């Protein structure tokens, strides 16, 4: 919320409170989203200062405080900084920002990441260019140097992150995005590739020296309708775990489809239907195997800009014999949300 705005600087302290519970068969182990209390809270700030007529500097920080956990030895589980970056935006020349921010492939994957709770299964975090990642400089240009209204593109250089775990590490890499939007219609695609750290090459699943991620998106968002389709392919970049050997790694190849349709009624209900399938190939020892395979139904009721309730049912088409052990049973979520 804009809590401060004098002398060219403006501060937005924001956050939400999410009362959230997951319902699933059994304990929730062999299910899509598990079973239990998943209440969480977010706090953050985004500030933006007017240096002069054409220049503007900005920074932003964002945190996930989990509320499902106790006050004992586990009180910090899943607590994390999500965003932390700062940058400048000069008139019609574009914007530059560095820190922990979103990879550019998400400029597409954000078309189908609109479900009341689930969806966007491919916007993995700490996975190169698809989701939030550490140490990215990102150049953005809005309306093409002030000329082509609706024409957007972005260039991003992704720094190395040699972390403890193969799953969160990444080497140097580059990527970019282009988007056109006109009067409700939107089409975009984006691509990025990057080296694999020696730790990543050493895992049993996924072998190659280069990782690649690309995606395209189609969307309609006007009147009260929202339609979206996402397609992408990856090489050596999507993370997997075969729980039968409890072996981790990366999927040599994947094919990802995400489809999303919603409508917004006058009385505030926003129903949601979606399809989401992610198929992997050349996974060592397995061959082909689905990782995400489900139909979604759900709805949100919007009391006003601050308050919302929602239900999210994942009719899960994963089979019990799934060769990677990905959960095969359905899962449904209930949520109550105050945000400011």
């Amino acid at each position: 919320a804009e809590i401060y705005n004098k002398d060219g600087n403006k501060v937005d302290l924001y956050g939400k409170a999410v009362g959230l519970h997951y319902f699933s068969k059994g304990n929730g182990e062999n299910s899509y989203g598990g079973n239990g209390d998943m209440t969480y809270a977010r706090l953050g700030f985004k500030g933006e200062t007017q240096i002069n007529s054409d220049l503007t500097g900005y920074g932003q920080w964002e945190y996930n405080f989990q509320g499902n956990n106790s006050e004992g030895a586990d009180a910090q589980t899943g607590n994390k900084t999500r965003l932390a970056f700062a940058g400048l935006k000069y008139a019609d020349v574009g914007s530059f920002d560095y820190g922990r921010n979103y990879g550019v492939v998400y400029d597409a994957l954000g078309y189908t990441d609109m479900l009341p709770e689930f969806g966007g299964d491919t916007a993995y975090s700490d996975d190169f260019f698809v989701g939030r990642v550490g140490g990215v400089a990102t150049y953005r240009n809005s309306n093409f140097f002030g000329l082509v209204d609706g024409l957007n593109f972005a260039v991003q250089y992704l720094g190395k992150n040699e972390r403890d775990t193969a799953r969160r590490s990444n080497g140097d890499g580059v990527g970019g995005s282009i988007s056109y939007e006109y009067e409700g219609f939107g089409i975009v695609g984006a691509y990025g590739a990057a080296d694999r750290t020696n730790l990543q090459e050493a895992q049993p699943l996924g072998n190659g020296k280069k990782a690649e991620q690309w995606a395209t998106g189609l969307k309609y968002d006007a009147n009260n309708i929202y339609l979206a389709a996402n397609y992408g392919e990856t090489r050596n970049a999507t993370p997997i775990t075969n729980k039968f050997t409890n072996t981790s790694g990366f999927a040599n190849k994947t094919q990802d489809v995400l489809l999303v349709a919603q409508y917004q009624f006058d009385f505030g209900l926003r129903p949601s239907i979606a399809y989401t399938k992610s198929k992997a190939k050349d996974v060592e020892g397995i061959g082909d195997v689905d990782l995400v395979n489900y139909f979604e139904v759900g709805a949100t009721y919007y009391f006003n800009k601050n308050m919302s309730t929602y239900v999210d049912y994942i009719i899960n088409q994963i089979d019990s014999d799934n060769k990677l052990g990905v959960g095969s049973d359905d899962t449904v979520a209930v949520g109550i949300v105050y945000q400011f």
């Binding site: 009624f265 006058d266 009385f267 505030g268 209900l269 129903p271 709805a299 009721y301 009391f303 309730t309 239900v311 209930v334 109550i336």
Partner: protein, 199 residues
């Protein structure tokens, strides 16, 4: 007028209206108004009717207009989640477009497709048993919601809803007691409204 068992209806009309109403129906309804505090009366109305909202949903889809199929949906979803299972009309205060009204069950769907009632009847404990409506309404027993109500639960559903429905009629008694053919008014009030519900 079009009524075959009119004479067997009129006996049971006299029976309910003139012995079963003074000796047991008005007794319990006055002793319902008088001894249960108001927040409970509209508290239980909502709990009962919420179970007849998932059915009203899917039968409003069947009637081809899904707009109110979602209205009955979110009323269900909302009141059953933030409203304690139904005791609270959260969706009713949320938006005027979500106001409550008489459910929309299978008999109403048969009427939308021009199936047609059957001969008007009037049982003793019941009061009106057209088989198309008060009978097709029973496929909603084969449903998400009503498929959990034991015999005594659905029997109890019928019981208290009646006590409540009677309770609030205790002044309008003069409208019907001074009527030409109180049987005809009761009968062709049923048909007018039951047709409405079938659209």
């Amino acid at each position: 007028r079009s009524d075959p068992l009119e004479g067997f209806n009129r006996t049971m009309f006299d029976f309910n209206y003139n012995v079963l109403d003074p000796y047991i129906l008005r007794p319990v309804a006055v002793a319902w108004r008088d001894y249960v505090p108001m927040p409970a009366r509209n508290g239980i109305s909502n709990f009962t009717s919420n179970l007849e909202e998932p059915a009203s949903m899917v039968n409003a889809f069947l009637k081809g207009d899904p707009y109110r199929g979602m209205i009955h949906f979110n009323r269900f979803f909302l009141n059953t989640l933030l409203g304690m299972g139904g005791l609270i009309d959260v969706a009713g205060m949320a938006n005027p477009k979500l106001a409550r009204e008489e459910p929309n069950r299978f008999g109403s769907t048969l009427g939308h497709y021009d199936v047609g009632y059957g001969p008007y009847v009037m049982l003793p404990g019941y009061g009106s048993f057209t088989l198309r409506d008060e009978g097709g309404d029973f496929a909603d027993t084969l449903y998400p919601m009503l498929s959990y109500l034991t015999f005594w639960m659905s029997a109890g559903k019928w019981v208290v809803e009646g006590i409540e429905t009677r309770a609030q009629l205790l002044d309008s008694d003069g409208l019907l007691r001074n009527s030409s053919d109180p049987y005809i008014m009761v009968r062709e009030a049923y048909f007018q409204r039951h047709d409405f519900i079938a659209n």
